[PDB]
């Protein structure tokens, strides 16, 4: 899940980041606070995924 998205264009990279932030990051957080989340390992996994996308954007845009 690192080189799969390396070759995509910047437009899709921004799109996938938005849905990563939108869903599975905000929704998971609300679920965990309310106590309805039992698989807490998704939170860390989603956070790392967001970091991966941002790393690609910087090495794509500008430099």
């Amino acid at each position: 899940m690192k080189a799969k998205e390396l070759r995509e264009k910047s437009v899709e990279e921004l799109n996938t980041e938005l849905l990563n932030l939108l869903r599975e990051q905000f929704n998971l957080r609300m679920q965990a606070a309310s106590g309805q989340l039992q698989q807490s390992h998704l939170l860390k996994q989603v956070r790392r995924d967001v970091a991966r996308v941002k790393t690609l954007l910087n090495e794509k845009a500008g430099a």
Binding site: L21, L22, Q25, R29, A33, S34
Partner: protein, 93 residues
């Protein structure tokens, strides 16, 4: 433009308590946790978009973390900000 992602990070979690429950059933207002800065405008926009509800006004306050005496050591909790959001006649959550 990072307004969309900003709105996705200001909200942290809902607040559950007796005061929260009575406020919801009586004043039709939701109390929830927000980021440390979380200006009133950002909270208002975030609730309108993420929760797809109409809001009237937002009141915010900062809660100071308590000092706890854990084991042989003294510690302090982190300050957090809670906001009261007053929904209009139409409420969803």
């Amino acid at each position: 433009m990072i307004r969309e992602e900003r709105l996705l990070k200001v909200l942290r979690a809902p607040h559950v308590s007796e005061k929260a429950s009575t406020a919801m059933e009586k004043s039709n207002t939701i109390v929830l946790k927000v980021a440390k800065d979380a200006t009133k405008a950002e909270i208002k926009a975030a609730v309108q978009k993420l929760f797809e509800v109409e809001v009237e006004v937002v009141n915010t306050l900062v809660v100071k973390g308590k000092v706890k005496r854990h084991g042989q050591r003294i510690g302090r909790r982190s300050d957090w900000k809670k906001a009261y959001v007053t929904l209009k006649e139409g409420q969803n959550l």
